[PDB]
Amino acid sequence: QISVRGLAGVENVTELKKNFNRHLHFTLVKDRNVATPRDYYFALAHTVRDHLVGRWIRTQQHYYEKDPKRIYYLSLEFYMGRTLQNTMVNLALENACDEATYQLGLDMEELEEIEEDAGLGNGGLGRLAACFLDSMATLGLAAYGYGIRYEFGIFNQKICGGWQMEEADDWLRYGNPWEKARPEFTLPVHFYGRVEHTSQGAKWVDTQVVLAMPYDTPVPGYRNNVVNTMRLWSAKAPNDFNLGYIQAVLDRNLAENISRVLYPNDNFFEGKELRLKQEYFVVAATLQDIIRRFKSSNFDAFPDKVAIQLNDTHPSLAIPELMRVLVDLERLDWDKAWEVTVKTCAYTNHTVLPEALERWPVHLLETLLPRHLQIIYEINQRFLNRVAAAFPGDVDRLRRMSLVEEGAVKRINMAHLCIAGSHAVNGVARIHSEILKKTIFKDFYELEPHKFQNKTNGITPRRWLVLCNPGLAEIIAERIGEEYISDLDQLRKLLSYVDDEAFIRDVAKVKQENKLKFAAYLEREYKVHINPNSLFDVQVKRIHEYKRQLLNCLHVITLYNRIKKEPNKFVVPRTVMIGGKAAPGYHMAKMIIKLITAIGDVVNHDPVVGDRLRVIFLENYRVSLAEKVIPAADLSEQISTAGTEASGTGNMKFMLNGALTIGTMDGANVEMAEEAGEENFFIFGMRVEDVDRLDQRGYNAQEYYDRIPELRQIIEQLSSGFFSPKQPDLFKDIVNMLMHHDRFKVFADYEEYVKCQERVSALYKNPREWTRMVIRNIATSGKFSSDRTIAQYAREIWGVEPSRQRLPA
Amino acid sequence: QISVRGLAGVENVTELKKNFNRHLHFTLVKDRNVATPRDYYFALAHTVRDHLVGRWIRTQQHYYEKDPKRIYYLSLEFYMGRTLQNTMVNLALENACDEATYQLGLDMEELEEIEEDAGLGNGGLGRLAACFLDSMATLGLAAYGYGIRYEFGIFNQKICGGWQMEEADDWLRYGNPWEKARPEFTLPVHFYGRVEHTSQGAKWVDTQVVLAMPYDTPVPGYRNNVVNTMRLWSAKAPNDFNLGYIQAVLDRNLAENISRVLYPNDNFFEGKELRLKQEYFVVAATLQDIIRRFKSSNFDAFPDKVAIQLNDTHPSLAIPELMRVLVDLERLDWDKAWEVTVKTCAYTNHTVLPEALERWPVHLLETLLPRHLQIIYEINQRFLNRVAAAFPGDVDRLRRMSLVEEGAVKRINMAHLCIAGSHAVNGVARIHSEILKKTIFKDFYELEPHKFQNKTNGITPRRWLVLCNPGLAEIIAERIGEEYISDLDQLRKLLSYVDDEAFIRDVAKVKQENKLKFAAYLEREYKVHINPNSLFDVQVKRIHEYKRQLLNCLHVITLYNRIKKEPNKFVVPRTVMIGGKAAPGYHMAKMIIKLITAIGDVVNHDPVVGDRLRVIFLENYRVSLAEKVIPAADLSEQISTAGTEASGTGNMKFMLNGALTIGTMDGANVEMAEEAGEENFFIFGMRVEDVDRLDQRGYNAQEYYDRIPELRQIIEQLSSGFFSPKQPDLFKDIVNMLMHHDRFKVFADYEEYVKCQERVSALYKNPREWTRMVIRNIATSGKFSSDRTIAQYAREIWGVEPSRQRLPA
Ligand SMILES: OC[C@H]1O[C@@H](c2nc(-c3ccc4ccccc4c3)cs2)[C@H](O)[C@@H](O)[C@@H]1O
Ligand SMILES: OC[C@H]1O[C@@H](c2nc(-c3ccc4ccccc4c3)cs2)[C@H](O)[C@@H](O)[C@@H]1O
Ligand SMILES: *Cc1c(COP(=O)(O)O)cnc(C)c1O
Ligand SMILES: *Cc1c(COP(=O)(O)O)cnc(C)c1O
């Protein structure tokens, strides 16, 4: 029906229909009389997977013949979401499958809704891994995603009495048609044991064996016929394991627990052994595979044939593990193995928040990975020997830069290990990379300035434009053609349509259609009634103090209080939608969700308010909900305290999808404002420099409470039980934190935020000038393509050249 | 190549080849350059499964339309073995697949060896379930096998220093292409909780929920185009289960443990809660499914539409469960629900051994199934009220017949529950059924003589002749045609070829070919060197005292001692092969394996013996090893103490496959000897009556030790460490048991056994008269077809008529 979804040829459609009926019969063992929508989804999935197989085999073949340099993206998290629509988009089958399914009397969109999200990630970091895989396939890189096949991904969020409840995300229950088990590439991973020192070097003995069984998922490039591989490891007991008899068999579960469940902390370190086991497991199995592939072509050439990218410190053990294999198994000398390791490894840092930094107790590494701790100590000694020689007498530098932290419990600083063991260290936005060089890695920067790079984050315009917003894709494609989907900088051509009446009307119609569609999705799936003519004010992201959902809450209560004070005055109507999961043990995050829903319970049932103000908590925010709500959004809330959001990627998704941003000069907000122009961005609040000035002299929240009557009222309402009549003190922890222990200076930005939110409402009253500013945003969003990001990784870190040339079909 | 394996048409072969290449590509995602033999096996499996699908769908369809009476075979055990060859045989694809694979340059026999046994059973009982499914499909009955999909079947047996080691049978590791998950027919099973009594009857509340997820495996009939279903339940945690967060997700394993592992006890009861959970799990899920199917047609008609066969007491809870559903959920009155239950249920008893009888402690049923215990108590009261009225004043009868056993711990006699709650109770051989009426169920017989039946056991001549012994099948098919494969009584026509020289030469050539093939299989897979011209003396069955492997050991040592006494005298050379698994906690069974291997270590390395006597322990005896060794056997050892082997089925397999039987008048040995004639059977030892006479006056083993010099020598050799030089006392438990606590009277049968074994050697010296006696055995083996058994169940218990008429292809 729309051109960017591809051709529906007569043969193609006929062929899809007969393969759909073949799979319903032979694969699902159903006839049409007893098939459920879920059978129909599976038949279609199997039918689309069949178009991947030829390209997958030819691509892996082609990498064997050409033997290019291979990129290994190691991440504990791949936030993939659904695969079916994405596969159709990249193979150009979407219209043909729409037509084929329509003729069989099925609605393809209904079948798409039956696919489980692959929720093998928490948020920003995990989703960056997924966008990267898409861009590496699209840029024809010989790239492999390596991670863990968690049986349970990020938990399903139910709201119960306005409180978050967690349910196990049992995403594999009905089968995963996208994965292919490769039991024959099963590899042993070792744990515990002890080190014997012999004549012929150190030997790791009396270990417990867990098997790593790989599952391959295809990653299709955008219409280039390239299909790369995501390999995820599953933990499996060896068959001699524990082997009274019955318990031995049941205790196999202990070993398999390693790949059972994703840790649901976003920017929070928990030093749990099971987490360290997951980290070693993925590293040990992946490095054996990388080396096996390398030997099927002397380790001087290893870094010419292998790049390993570490997605944060989560796979930092890749550095000692590569040393251990090269020194203990391959018998290279220390210095040669170390050169190979540094030239192979590169480290992406994702946060500056201290509580997020991985600092593993030594006693844990001692018991679990005895040999790795020895190699870490040896790395530390040689590293501090170079610091001492470059900065003689600077003993405090030696303490600050040590991989080993002294204290009550000794800890390994995994970030320090990553910098020492990597030829390149990057942040994920220019301001973040600058903060790394000025503050937390200042000392490492001064020693090896050449290692520190910026690679500003990006999003795949395939999932985040073509797939979630076909109507916007199309009206863009009507004026400038299709080429921008793999070259997003071409969106700049839209600046010459900023005064075109037809284009202004088309941009605004698509937004209205997305809002109508989302408003309807709310009424069906969650019996809630929103005015589609309201401004859609949305904050969707994990629930964290630093992301200041609470600042948003303060604005919402301010709007409420202003309506009640002057009931009969015009206010631009808004639907305020906030959504995110809280980490299950993050008390404050769980209280913020409860406050959000408690504001809703007051605001949405006030007769005086009407449909002028609605507050909706969006339940179970995940990738597939982001594909629906982001295209429906008018205002993107990016309101982190300056210096806390390393980058953000939500900000980019919304910029691409025709929403204006209200945000701080934080993360990639800075580069977004610079691309669009500051006049096309609702910037407010402290800069990094202002927060620093507040810290030097001390943050007194009382000062703001005492000077801002509007803010005092909100705090009194919270305290006195205006929003919690049956439990008047329900929110004392929130009030108490905002008044005495606010690390994120919520009150400091309150006034500038509310004023800036008035400027938003004013622009929204003028639809034409709102839409023109939206066009200026979409048109300058090109930089924020993960294609640009990956091309920069490739040229400046991996040493490989991207390509948009097609493989043969 | 051979006619009973079907036609290899040009189109059929072309079509199989192109579907094999389609599956290698689309299903396995391999090209021919990287495929392993295991990929080739999977492609073939998928290719053969594709021929099942049409017939499976049409058959289940046809049962919906015709709505026949449905048979539900409830068993905790289905000993299926491999599915690939069996599927080819019953679909007539074997020659076509041989030809199709040959042209692709593969050997189908090599690919068959890659299939894992489905070892979801211990031995006789489990394998009877598998033969029954084959016969019910072949006789066109609307029959369903219902059991548990164990993640781990019967353990893999390694021999280490002559000792049994158990390894987990991880049979699902590479996938099972034969099963189809039906997640959409998932059902809740309840545990624990408590009973509330209301106005509207009793209510089972505050239960823990385990989900039962069914997997369907096709069961093809023999060339009738019928495909029945084996439905196996897998335990699955509900997604709210336990729902700090991480442990909650890991604790899901507790619920899923229910379907994790098969209990490896053959004829031994262990009162473990996990075993009771498995028993309720399969019963609760199966009865919900049976009732759902029944309501898709008032419970008066239930027994006209439903037969439930209980394979021993393992699913006895089906009786209280059916009462609980009918009374508590469907609101029938007690008496009407009870009539329905008795008319629906039938109980097959498999053993008289007291230690095998399921006697569940009340405290276990109290905690786990509170409501079932109440219904059991109510059944007991009404049952004993009928005993009291029929036998007034006989208070001892009341104690003996009670479902509730009094004592230290109160127990439920599950066998008593089965007799009370069933319209029919059968044994599994005529002598066994007679012993049930004279001894252990005498009282139940006197009350309800009409319930007690015999159904002599049988074996499927598809797996146990056509599949394992194609060369014997063929030479039979050359003279009398193919019709006998589904009508085994036609083998009687072979009695008119008992004096045909060509047929005598053909029977003997096939035996020699089977022996050459098996001798070679030993040399390859287990580096052992047997003379193929020796008599193949084989005892294969679970290791149990009652089966008297030890009697066999005594004969073997007797032959050894006789050779050493007269080195230079001729003895018929023998290969003595003994094989079986011991239950992991069965000390004595584990000692017997060690003795067997310890005799081997002495006998096989004695230069004076030569290749005149070899002793081989056959490692990992399972269905697929039975298919190899049984066709190679000359002498079948069936030497249980009279009254202990309820039936046996091995005995039948060997009779069918051209081996002569040395055995006691025990189990179906009696009916085999009566069919063939006693002169065509090596019968020895005590009858049932003689054992009874020995018991009355007392079994003194010393008496035999004192009168049989040959036996004294063996006992002295065992005691003094002749067979265990480094541990002289290794076998003191064996000697001590044979001398003071032999329940099975091994010495009582020793003399008559050795004499009878001399008669065997004498006949073997005359090949022509040996082969003529073999023909008399094969020719009278027809009764021992599971087709006869199932036709008798159908007409005399289930009330349905078998059919050999084809469904349309
Ligand atoms: O670069 C991609 C995005 O990364 C986000 C980030 N995620 C994380 C993150 C996630 C999961 C973890 C699990 C265990 C221990 C630490 C963890 C840290 C850190 S920083 C950052 O918070 C975002 O600013 C940024 O856009
Ligand atoms: O009828 C089929 C065969 O059944 C054999 C039998 N198996 C069993 C058997 C198996 C597994 C068990 C697991 C747990 C508790 C009790 C169990 C009993 C009993 S009797 C009998 O021992 C054989 O004689 C007979 O041929
Ligand atoms: C993009 C995305 C994120 C990251 O959003 P931020 O606003 O950068 O925190 C988190 N969750 C999901 C589901 C996403 O798609
Ligand atoms: C048939 C069979 C049995 C039963 O044999 P018996 O001699 O009756 O005990 C046990 N195990 C396997 C593998 C079988 O095929």
The ligand that comes nearest to the alpha carbon of residue B652 is 4
Q: Which of B56, B242, B246, B265 is most worth mutating to test chain A (most A CB atoms within 10 A of its CB)?
A: B246
What distance in Å separates the CA atoms of residue B80 and residue B460, rounded to the nearest whole number?
12
Give the DSSP letter of residue B685: S
Give the DSSP letter of residue A311: E
CB contact under 8 A, B166 and A245: yes
Instruction: With residue A120 as reference, give the H or E element that holds it.
Output: strand A118-120
CB contact under 8 A, B168 and A239: yes
Q: List the residue whose alpha carbon is closest to atom 8 of ligand 4.
A: B648
Helix (H, G, I), strand (E, B), or coil: what is residue B213? strand
Determine contact: A765 vs chain B, CB below 8 A.
no
CA torsion, ordered B738, B740, B742, B743, to nearest 10 deg: 180
- B contact residues 174-213, partner A, Cβ 8 Å cutoff: 174-175, 180-181, 183-184
Using the mean position of ligand 1's atoms as its centre, give its distance from the Cα of residue A79 in Å.
Answer: 12
In terms of Cβ atoms closer than 10 Å to its own Cβ (0-12, 13-18, 19+), residue B385 is exposed
Determine contact: B250 vs chain A, CB below 8 A.
yes
State whether CATH 3.40.50.2000 applies to domain A1-458+786-809: yes
List the beta strands (DSSP E) in B199-296.
Answer: 201-220, 227-236
- Share in percent of chain B as helix, strand, coil (round to 5): 55, 15, 30
Using the mean position of ligand 2's atoms as its centre, give its distance from the Cα of residue A217 in Å.
Answer: 45
Phi, psi of B753 (to 5 degrees): -60, -55
CB B51 within 8 A of CB B90: no
Ligand 2 touching residue B234 (CB < 6 A): no
What distance in Å separates the CA atoms of residue A38 and residue A44, rounded to the nearest whole number?
10
Q: What is the CA radius of gyration of chain A?
A: 27
CB A425 within 8 A of CB A448: no
List the beta strands (DSSP E) in A619-694.
Answer: 635-638, 660-663, 682-683
CB contact under 8 A, A250 and B260: yes
Fold matches, B1-458+786-809 and B459-785: yes
Strands A70-74 and A306-311: parallel
What distance in Å separates the CA atoms of residue B94 and residue B77, rounded to the nearest whole number?
28
Structure tokens at B673: 């000897």
What distance in Å separates the CA atoms of residue A784 and residue B747, rounded to the nearest whole number?
89
Of A29, A54, A239, the CB nearest to B180: A29
Amino acid at A233: W
Q: What is the DSSP secondary-structure string of A191-222?
A: EEEEEEEETTEEEEEEEEEEEEEEEEEEEE-S
Is residue A614 part of the annotated active site? The answer reads no
Of A181, A243, A260, the CB nearest to B249: A260
B437 φψ region: left (φ > 0), alpha (ψ -120 to 50), beta (else) = alpha
The one catalytic residue among A653, A745, A776, A783: A653
- B contact residues 581-640, partner A, Cβ 8 Å cutoff: 584-585
Specify the residue for token string 């489980």. A116
Determine contact: A672 vs chain B, CB below 8 A.
no
What distance in Å separates the CA atoms of residue B19 and residue A320, rounded to the nearest whole number?
48
Closest by CA to B169, choosing from B111, B121, B235, is B121
Q: Which residues of A touch B20 (CB under 8 A)?
A: none
Q: List the residue whose alpha carbon is closest to atom 7 of ligand 3.
A: A650
Is residue A515 part of the annotated active site? The answer reads no
The one catalytic residue among A423, A542, A548, A594: A542
The one catalytic residue among B55, B574, B612, B653: B653
Structure tokens at A245: 């008899």
What distance in Å separates the CA atoms of residue A43 and residue A28, rounded to the nearest whole number?
7
Length of chain A: 809
Is residue A541 part of the annotated active site? The answer reads yes
Question: Could you tell me how far CA A331 lies from the centroid of its own chain?
Answer: 39
What distance in Å separates the CA atoms of residue B494 and residue B680, rounded to the nearest whole number?
15
Specify the residue for token string 């990597």. A422
Q: Which of B186, B243, B293 is most worth mutating to test chain A (most A CB atoms within 10 A of its CB)?
A: B243
CA torsion, ordered A255, A256, A257, A263, to nearest 10 deg: 120
From B34's Cα to the closest Cα of chain A, the distance in A is 10
CB B216 within 8 A of CB B230: yes
CB B552 within 8 A of CB B578: yes
- A contact residues 31-50, partner B, Cβ 8 Å cutoff: 31, 36, 38, 50
CB contact under 8 A, A250 and B261: yes
Using the mean position of ligand 3's atoms as its centre, give its distance from the Cα of residue B718 in Å.
Answer: 75
Structure tokens at B369: 């199934």
CB contact under 8 A, B57 and A249: no
The ligand that comes nearest to the alpha carbon of residue B313 is 2
Is residue A350 part of the annotated active site? The answer reads yes
Specify the residue for token string 């997997």. B215
Taking residue B679's Cβ as centre, other Cβ atoms within 10 Å add up to 9
Q: Which residues of B touch A166 (CB under 8 A)?
A: 243, 245
The ligand that comes nearest to the alpha carbon of residue A131 is 3
Q: What is the DSSP secondary-structure string of B593-635?
A: HHHHHHHHHHHTT-TTTTTSEEEEEETT--HHHHHHHTTT-SE
What distance in Å separates the CA atoms of residue B87 and residue B85, rounded to the nearest whole number?
5
CB contact under 8 A, A236 and B173: yes
Residue in chain B nearest A48 by alpha carbon: B26
| Axis-axis angle for helices B549-565, B709-720 (nearest 10) | 100
Phi, psi of B375 (to 5 degrees): -65, -35
Is residue A740 part of the annotated active site? The answer reads no
Structure tokens at A403: 């991989």
What distance in Å separates the CA atoms of residue B557 and residue B535, rounded to the nearest whole number?
17
Ligand 2 touching residue B266 (CB < 6 A): yes
Helix (H, G, I), strand (E, B), or coil: what is residue A659? coil
CB A612 within 8 A of CB A573: yes
Using the mean position of ligand 3's atoms as its centre, give its distance from the Cα of residue A801 in Å.
Answer: 29
The ligand that comes nearest to the alpha carbon of residue B267 is 2
Structure tokens at B463: 């797996």
CB contact under 8 A, A245 and B170: no
Strands B682-683 and B143-148: unpaired
In terms of Cβ atoms closer than 10 Å to its own Cβ (0-12, 13-18, 19+), residue B480 is middle
Domain ranges of chain B: 1-458+786-809, 459-785
Which residue numbers in chain B precede an interruption (C–N > 2.5 Å)? Answer: 243, 297
Of A29, A240, A272, the CB nearest to B56: A29
3-class SS letters over A510-522: HHHHHHHHHHHHH
Of A54, A181, A246, the CB nearest to B261: A246
Taking residue B653's Cβ as centre, other Cβ atoms within 10 Å add up to 28
What distance in Å separates the CA atoms of residue B629 and residue B541, rounded to the nearest whole number?
12
Mutate to test the pocket of ligand 4, among B131, B541, B544 (most ligand atoms within 8 A of CB): B541
C-alpha pair distances (Å), B228 with each of A30, A145, A524, B48, B70 = 15, 43, 42, 16, 11
CB A657 within 8 A of CB A633: yes
Give the DSSP letter of residue A626: H
Instruction: With residue B21 as reference, give the H or E element that holds it.
Output: helix B10-22
Amino acid at A155: F
Is residue B5 part of the annotated active site? The answer reads no
Structure tokens at A451: 């290692």
Q: Which of A170, A246, A262 is most worth mutating to test chain B (most B CB atoms within 10 A of its CB)?
A: A246
Q: What is the DSSP secondary-structure string of A434-491?
A: HHHHHTTTHHHHHH-GGGEEE----B-HIIIIIIT-HHHHHHHHHHH-SGGGG-GGGG
Structure tokens at B212: 């039962």
Q: What is the experimental resolution, given in Å to one decimal place?
A: 2.4
CB contact under 8 A, A53 and B264: no
Ligand 2 touching residue B356 (CB < 6 A): yes
CB B188 within 8 A of CB B280: no
| CA of B668, closest atom in ligand 2 | 26
The one catalytic residue among B314, B324, B350, B511: B350
CB A522 within 8 A of CB A616: yes
The one catalytic residue among A5, A511, A547, A776: A547
- Share in percent of chain A as helix, strand, coil (round to 5): 55, 15, 30
Closest by CA to B383, choosing from B402, B400, B399, is B402
CB A98 within 8 A of CB A231: no
What distance in Å separates the CA atoms of residue B750 and residue B741, rounded to the nearest whole number?
16
State whether CATH 3.40.50.720 applies to domain B459-785: no
